[PDB]
Amino acid sequence: EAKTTLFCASDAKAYEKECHNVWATHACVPTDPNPQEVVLEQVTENFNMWKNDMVDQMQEDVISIWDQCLKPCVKLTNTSTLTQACPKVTFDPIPIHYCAPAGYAILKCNNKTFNGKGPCNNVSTVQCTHGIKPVVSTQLLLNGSLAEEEIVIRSKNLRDNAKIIIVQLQKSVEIVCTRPNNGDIRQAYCQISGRNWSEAVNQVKKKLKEHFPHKNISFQSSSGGDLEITTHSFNCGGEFFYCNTSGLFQDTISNATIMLPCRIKQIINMWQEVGKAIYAPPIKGQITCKSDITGLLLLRDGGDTTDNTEIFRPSGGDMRDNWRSELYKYKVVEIK
Ligand SMILES: *[C@@H]1O[C@H](CO)[C@@H](O[C@@H]2O[C@H](CO)[C@@H](O[C@@H]3O[C@H](CO[C@H]4O[C@H](CO)[C@@H](O)[C@H](O)[C@@H]4O)[C@@H](O)[C@H](O[C@H]4O[C@H](CO)[C@@H](O)[C@H](O)[C@@H]4O)[C@@H]3O)[C@H](O)[C@H]2NC(C)=O)[C@H](O)[C@H]1NC(C)=O
Ligand SMILES: *[C@@H]1O[C@H](CO)[C@@H](O)[C@H](O)[C@H]1NC(C)=O
Ligand SMILES: *[C@@H]1O[C@H](CO)[C@@H](O)[C@H](O)[C@H]1NC(C)=O
Ligand SMILES: *[C@@H]1O[C@H](CO)[C@@H](O)[C@H](O)[C@H]1NC(C)=O
Ligand SMILES: *[C@@H]1O[C@H](CO)[C@@H](O)[C@H](O)[C@H]1NC(C)=O
Ligand SMILES: *[C@@H]1O[C@H](CO)[C@@H](O)[C@H](O)[C@H]1NC(C)=O
């Protein structure tokens, strides 16, 4: 159980102008062409997704990616003002693998319902993690991995309402967000199957109810905070989308097609550090991301629930939680 400096590996192509590729060609080595996995027999190891230095390293790398790929024109902090060249770039996240250096291995939990904190009974050793897209978002976790058997609820302590709940879905729900070619260059929309979304919500609700027996599970919109957190926010092709999810986080959801209104914003509250980053107006043309919703970030309301209802609202903002949603099954160990 030691802290070491992981290295990254990817399939980035040197000819590719896409920024994640450009960053990874310099920062990472090539993906392991022949990866070996060794099942450890009759072995139990403790994992803690909430105290895992792998998360802090990924955070540093995504910050480094965004420093190259999403350079704001103006960056404001309470101690600083920066004005700089801010060219548009080609942006589409690629998978990144995190790898143990010599004298260290990465243990991988293979229990398919492991909650991320406690003993794992089916462990194997790997050199590198599977490829993980560094997708930055709030509310909905996009383009990540699915739970194999059932929905998994992950929290440092479910009884602490202040702690984020990471939900991992078993079945993904598609979301297509589009700023059409064109009147209002900042208006966009997402389309999602209400049938599929509603089924996901119902399954997540049933899993939550197992931890709050005799309580009715309600989903509601965020109580307040920055727009990054009160909307589903993500970057699509270099543009910052803010998508209203009032249609999603409700107790009555239609089985028809749901349309979410979105805005593209130039002024964003940064996740990397406290401050504002100001970007140039959106590129021309159709901007579209079709993504798989593979998880949720939820916060449960605190206080006496007079109604016998537990209320859950979408949340996010600390992108370490995004990385935890993928790194929960891994831990770095010193071989000897
Ligand atoms: C979640 O994950 C999904 C994928 O799993 C992401 O969706 C992908 O988004 C990328 C880019 O945003 C898509 O790739 C782009 O596709 C464009 C069209 O591709 C079709 O048409 C071309 C041309 O005929 C075919 O060759 C191709 O096979 C497809 O049939 C391309 O035009 C793009 O390439 C262009 O720009 C690049 C920039 O580097 C240039 O190098 C190229 O020369 C070219 O000009 C690009 O390849 C991809 O298709 C999407 N996948 C799916 C399944 O939709 C989501 O964006 C992601 N969500 C988030 C939030 O990150
Ligand atoms: C800037 O903000 C941080 C916390 O966000 C605070 O600790 C620091 O004192 C602030 N500095 C100034 C000059 O306001
Ligand atoms: C995986 O570990 C969890 C947590 O103890 C346990 O409930 C479950 O039975 C385990 N699954 C298997 C297949 O051993
Ligand atoms: C729901 O998901 C299934 C597969 O996951 C897909 O075939 C179907 O088209 C989706 N429903 C809608 C309305 O898009
Ligand atoms: C989302 O849209 C609903 C209905 O138009 C509105 O009441 C709510 O204030 C919006 N939320 C955000 C964060 O835009
Ligand atoms: C969708 O919901 C309506 C009622 O709101 C119902 O009549 C219809 O059968 C449902 N469709 C499916 C495929 O479940």
Numbering used by the authors: 47 to 124, 198 to 301, 324 to 396, 412 to 492
Published text:
The HIV-1 envelope (Env) spike, a trimer of gp120-gp41 heterodimers, is the only target of neutralizing antibodies (Abs). As exemplified by VRC01, the first such bNAb to be isolated, VRC01-class bNAbs share a common mode of gp120 binding in which the VH1-2*02-derived variable heavy (VH) domain mimics CD4. Two forms of designed gp120-based immunogens were subsequently engineered to bind and activate germline HC/LC VRC01-class B cell receptors: gp120 outer domain-only constructs (eOD-GT6 and eOD-GT8) (Jardine et al., 2013; 2015) and gp120s modified from the clade C 426c Env (McGuire et al., 2013; 2014; 2016). Here, we present crystal structures of inferred germline VRC01-like Abs alone and complexed with 426c-based gp120 immunogen cores and compare and contrast their gp120 recognition with structures of mature VRC01-class Ab/gp120 complexes.
We also solved structures of unbound 3BNC60GL and 426c.TM4△V1-3 (at 1.9 Å and 2.0 Å resolution, respectively), and a complex structure of a 426c.TM4△V1-3 bound to 3BNC55MAT, a mature VRC01-class Ab. We addressed potential changes in antigen structure resulting from germline and mature Ab binding by comparing structures of free and bound 426c.TM4△1–3 gp120 core. The 426c.TM4△1–3 structure was solved using crystals of the gp120 core alone and again as part of the analysis of the 3BNC60GL/426c.TM4△V1-3 crystals in which the crystallographic asymmetric unit included two copies of unbound 426c.TM4△V1-3 gp120 along with two copies of the 3BNC60GL/426c.TM4△V1-3 complex. We compared the unbound 426c.TM4△V1-3 structures to those of 426c.TM4△V1-3 complexed with Fabs from 3BNC60GL and from a mature VRC01-class Ab, 3BNC55MAT. We found no major structural rearrangements resulting from binding of either a germline or mature Ab, suggesting that the 426c gp120 core immunogens are preformed for binding to germline and mature forms of VRC01-class Abs. Since these immunogens lack the V1V2 and V3 loops, potential rearrangement of these regions in the context of the trimer upon binding remains to be studied.
